[PDB]
Amino acid sequence: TVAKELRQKSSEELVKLVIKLKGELLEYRFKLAHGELDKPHLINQTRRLLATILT
RNA sequence: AGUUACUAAGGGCUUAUGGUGGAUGCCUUGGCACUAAUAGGCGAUGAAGGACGUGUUAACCUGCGAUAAGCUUC
Ligand SMILES: [Mg+2]
Ligand SMILES: [Mg+2]
């Protein structure tokens, strides 16, 4: 499902996605280390989407 | 003058009960010996075996490898 949508995307847009998700993942981990992450599942969702984009 | 019981500090015997202990009996996600087939290898495209790390999850075990408790396709 999601893999089909990313396949529709071009390569340059995909690398923009990966750098943006890397930044967001860093922010989520820092907020968790400060006890300010209400949604603790977005870390896992970010990592899976990151892994899928890498595939 | 004569023959005399009671005593139980404690102990002995019988029976009953309580406590420590895990013998006997019943059972087992475990072992042993084989039968009928399959197969008889992995590695410089990095092996067998380990260290480290990975959780929204204290440690340990298991899974996994910076795509890290999982990624794609049929
Ligand atoms: Mg007495
Ligand atoms: Mg007595």
Curated annotation (Swiss-Prot):
Transmembrane segments: none annotated. Signal peptide: none annotated. Residues 1-55 are annotated as: Large ribosomal subunit protein uL29. Belongs to the universal ribosomal protein uL29 family. This is Large ribosomal subunit protein uL29. It comes from Mycoplasma pneumoniae (strain ATCC 29342 / M129 / Subtype 1).
